[PDB]
Amino acid sequence: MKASRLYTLVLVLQPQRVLLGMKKRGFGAGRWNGFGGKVQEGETIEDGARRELQEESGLTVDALHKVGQIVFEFVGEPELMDVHVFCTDSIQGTPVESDEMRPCWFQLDQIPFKDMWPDNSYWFPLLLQKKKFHGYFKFQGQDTILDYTLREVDTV
Ligand SMILES: Nc1nc2c([nH]c(=O)n2[C@H]2C[C@H](O)[C@@H](COP(=O)(O)OP(=O)(O)OP(=O)(O)O)O2)c(=O)[nH]1
Numbered sequence: 467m468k469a470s471r472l473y474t475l476v477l478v479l480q481p482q483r484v485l486l487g488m489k490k491r492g493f494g495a496g497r498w499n500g501f502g503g504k505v506q507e508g509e510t511i512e513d514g515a516r517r518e519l520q521e522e523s524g525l526t527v528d529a530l531h532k533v534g535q536i537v538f539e540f541v542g543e544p545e546l547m548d549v550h551v552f553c554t555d556s557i558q559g560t561p562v563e564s565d566e567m568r569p570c571w572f573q574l575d576q577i578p579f580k581d582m583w584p585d586n587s588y589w590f591p592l593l594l595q596k597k598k599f600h601g602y603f604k605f606q607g608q609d610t611i612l613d614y615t616l617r618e619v620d621t622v
């Protein structure tokens with residue numbers, strides 16, 4: 467089995483809208499996603515999620531709720547991505563656009579699934595229902611899922 471690298475993903479989910487960030491530069495740009503990145507040495511997963519939210523979106527929150535975990539495998543890549551998914555409903559500043567990321571609010575009847583990673587269509591609806599989940603997705607490139615598993619869980 468492949469080794470896996472730890473990542474976080476943060477969704478700011480308010481009662482009527484969700485905050486997403488559009489990748490501005492590099493390869494893979496043009497998709498909306500939660501805020502996140504690699505966990506760094508010595509930090510807890512939750513603290514890495516708070517750090518990435520601040521660095522990417524400019525938002526500082528005191529805490530996050532863990533809602534899921536999703537493992538991504540890419541054909542031709544040696545490591546899995548072990549992505550710990552967090553939520554919060556409570557913010558106290560404004561999102562900030564950078565050269566790398568543009569944050570944007572979407573109403574919850576306008577979730578931009580067509581411009582999100584294909585796996586999001588499967589697990590995002592569970593997140594919206596206050597459910598917790600574990601998932602795994604194998605991708606060929608950016609657009610094609612070859613295999614996936616998804617399960618609702620009581621505890622993550
Ligand atoms: N399938 C899927 N892949 C995702 C999602 N979100 C997400 O970042 N990815 C993948 C695509 C990118 O290749 C990779 C982004 O991680 P990253 O390399 O930007 O993390 P980072 O910011 O710590 O790295 P770096 O820019 O500092 O080098 O993760 C998602 O929601 N679904």
Ligand code: NA
Nearest residue numbers: 502503504522
């Ligand atoms: Na990132």
